[PDB]
Amino acid sequence: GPQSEPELKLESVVIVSRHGVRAPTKATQLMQDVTPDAWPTWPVKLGWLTPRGGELIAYLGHYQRQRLVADGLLAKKGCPQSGQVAIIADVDERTRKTGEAFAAGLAPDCAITVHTQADTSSPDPLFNPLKTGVCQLDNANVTDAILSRAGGSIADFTGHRQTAFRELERVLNFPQSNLCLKCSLTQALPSELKVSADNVSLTGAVSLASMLTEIFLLQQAQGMPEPGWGRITDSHQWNTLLSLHNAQFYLLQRTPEVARSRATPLLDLIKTALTPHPPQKQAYGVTLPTSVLFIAGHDTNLANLGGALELNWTLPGQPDNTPPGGELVFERWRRLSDNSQWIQVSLVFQTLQQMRDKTPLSLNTPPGEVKLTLAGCEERNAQGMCSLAGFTQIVNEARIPACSL
Ligand SMILES: [K+]
Ligand code: NI
């Protein structure tokens, strides 16, 4: 019957995904000392993807197949052919397994290759060129930029967030902890900004809180019976706790003086996947451009891209602004009225309840989705997309040539 008159046609999609639910990457003495209670144990090694984590990613893969079929970009049946779908992952187990999980959902029994760099025992600079020394941060500029975004000092930062720290202390039962028996997390563990040529980090309570509140969220998404020892009982509490995780990434990963450098290889890969040109084999042996590119990375990659491109978002129903399986989705659309080219960016994610309930996703039960705007874009169409030329200029301005591969 008479369907909606197509105004735009989808040409290409690039999905930059955080890996799915993983076991905590550390088990430190300080984590033991800040609570009298025992941390729940995990079914996989430190930092590895859990089976449930993979099942949640495959749900997003299944959903993406349904909606890309609806958009006309992929075929309803059969496998995608001749590199129509490509997958690139970081070398870590949790990212490679995320790529395998997404392929399993998008195109089951089609053994789509999960590409990595040749040496999987060494870091891939695409996901952080600082880590292999491709380039370095500017120490004075990064320090000033982060401290300013903190409110002028890390003390000012923690001074404005005492409500959230007190909520974490309650969940920890911190007053009955060994650290307390000697009480306030921020004063017991003074936080300072450490800036080196290759990394930025915060010490003390700020970084501890970001980690621990992430762990509670992973416990919830994993389906563990009582996250935070049963002391997290409503959504306001979840939002208050994860604000500490979000706040650290705002400072350390969204600040442009860090984000532009760390995101430059990803920016280049995204722009080459989205740019119309004769298809040509390039990075990882992958032929670009193509229909669908899935990149399996990390929390910091989403934040770095958001900071470098001036994309801002909060995720309704998902307290972690960079959640497991969260996807930054870049799409190239052709406007049929004049066959002009446009870029849309959105953030696709499972709500915390969808993770808690292990909700299979479909057109009828979609993940959450936030439409984004490139703040620097001066040429937008009626749907808020940026012109291909405008997007290209933004990326060329944001990228840092010394950080490119
Ligand atoms: K302030
Ligand atoms: Ni996150």
Side-chain angles (χ1 to χ4, degrees):
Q3 294 153 273
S4 34
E5 190 49 42
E7 190 188 341
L8 303 146
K9 178 168 184 55
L10 183 59
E11 301 256 59
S12 190
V13 188
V14 179
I15 298 159
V16 184
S17 174
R18 185 184 173 201
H19 56 74
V21 177
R22 53 147 178 83
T25 62
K26 316 185 222 333
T28 71
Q29 184 65 42
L30 178 61
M31 283 159 61
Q32 304 280 309
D33 286 350
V34 296
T35 175
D37 301 287
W39 290 93
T41 62
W42 283 74
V44 298
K45 306 182 184 183
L46 302 151
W48 277 28
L49 194 78
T50 71
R52 176 157 165 146
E55 286 163 343
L56 295 168
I57 299 298
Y59 287 159
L60 285 167
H62 178 84
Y63 167 77
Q64 286 297 355
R65 177 65 176 275
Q66 287 197 356
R67 80 100 168 175
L68 293 171
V69 169
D71 287 331
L73 188 65
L74 290 178
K76 185 174 182 354
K77 286 168 163 182
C79 295
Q81 295 288 311
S82 325
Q84 192 178 24
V85 174
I87 300 177
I88 295 173
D90 202 1
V91 296
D92 302 298
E93 193 270 356
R94 59 184 180 268
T95 44
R96 296 177 75 180
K97 270 32 211 183
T98 292
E100 292 295 356
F102 187 83
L106 187 84
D109 300 330
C110 323
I112 296 175
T113 304
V114 176
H115 291 91
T116 70
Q117 85 172 359
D119 183 7
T120 71
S121 74
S122 147
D124 181 348
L126 167 75
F127 294 87
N128 180 5
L130 297 170
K131 176 55 181 253
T132 73
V134 175
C135 61
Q136 298 176 321
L137 300 174
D138 175 321
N139 185 301
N141 290 354
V142 167
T143 297
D144 193 60
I146 295 180
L147 292 180
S148 182
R149 281 158 67 83
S153 77
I154 303 307
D156 194 278
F157 183 80
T158 63
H160 284 299
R161 297 170 170 77
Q162 277 313 119
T163 295
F165 280 105
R166 291 210 112 261
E167 182 94 68
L168 173 60
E169 289 166 13
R170 184 190 62 76
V171 168
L172 290 172
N173 194 13
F174 179 66
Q176 308 280 34
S177 73
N178 285 346
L179 182 54
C180 172
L181 301 172
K182 88 285 102 181
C183 279
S184 157
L185 254 189
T186 62
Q187 307 310 325
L189 305 171
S191 304
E192 67 182 305
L193 178 71
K194 311 266 188 103
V195 177
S196 65
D198 65 312
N199 201 238
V200 297
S201 73
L202 292 152
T203 68
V206 172
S207 56
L208 178 66
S210 177
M211 183 173 99
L212 297 189
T213 60
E214 184 56 14
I215 289 173
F216 297 143
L217 188 123
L218 297 168
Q219 294 171 350
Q220 176 81 345
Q222 180 60 25
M224 305 194 151
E226 292 173 17
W229 305 280
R231 299 195 275 261
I232 315 172
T233 57
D234 70 55
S235 59
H236 187 250
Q237 294 178 358
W238 279 112
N239 296 333
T240 302
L241 289 171
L242 271 297
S243 74
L244 298 172
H245 171 77
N246 296 329
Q248 189 192 230
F249 274 74
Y250 173 86
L251 290 186
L252 300 191
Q253 304 297 336
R254 288 194 53 98
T255 298
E257 285 79 0
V258 175
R260 291 169 73 200
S261 288
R262 292 199 28 148
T264 284
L266 275 172
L267 285 176
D268 295 345
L269 175 59
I270 292 163
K271 211 182 136 263
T272 184
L274 293 169
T275 295
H277 39 104
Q280 171 222 285
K281 177 190 119 213
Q282 35 208 287
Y284 305 89
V286 166
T287 288
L288 300 179
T290 192
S291 291
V292 179
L293 177 63
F294 182 86
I295 304 171
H298 307 271
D299 196 308
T300 76
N301 298 130
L302 294 187
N304 295 155
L305 288 166
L309 296 176
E310 313 176 299
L311 302 158
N312 285 107
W313 68 82
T314 325
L315 303 181
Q318 175 49 259
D320 180 353
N321 275 161
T322 42
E327 300 175 353
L328 199 52
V329 178
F330 300 80
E331 309 163 307
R332 184 164 50 83
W333 294 85
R334 174 167 56 94
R335 180 169 67 189
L336 302 172
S337 66
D338 58 355
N339 284 338
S340 54
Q341 300 284 339
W342 299 91
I343 302 294
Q344 180 162 254
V345 195
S346 55
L347 208 301
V348 171
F349 64 96
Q350 284 142 313
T351 69
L352 191 47
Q353 201 48 51
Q354 279 174 335
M355 303 182 178
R356 181 57 167 186
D357 298 340
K358 205 174 131 153
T359 301
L361 302 172
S362 63
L363 297 188
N364 155 56
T365 310
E369 181 152 24
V370 184
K371 301 215 154 333
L372 311 173
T373 171
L374 297 144
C377 184
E378 325 155 273
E379 190 182 11
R380 298 193 253 251
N381 69 8
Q383 292 80 12
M385 319 192 166
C386 198
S387 69
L388 178 54
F391 183 78
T392 294
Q393 198 27 60
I394 288 166
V395 172
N396 282 326
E397 280 191 38
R399 71 188 300 279
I400 305 300
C403 293
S404 59
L405 309 186

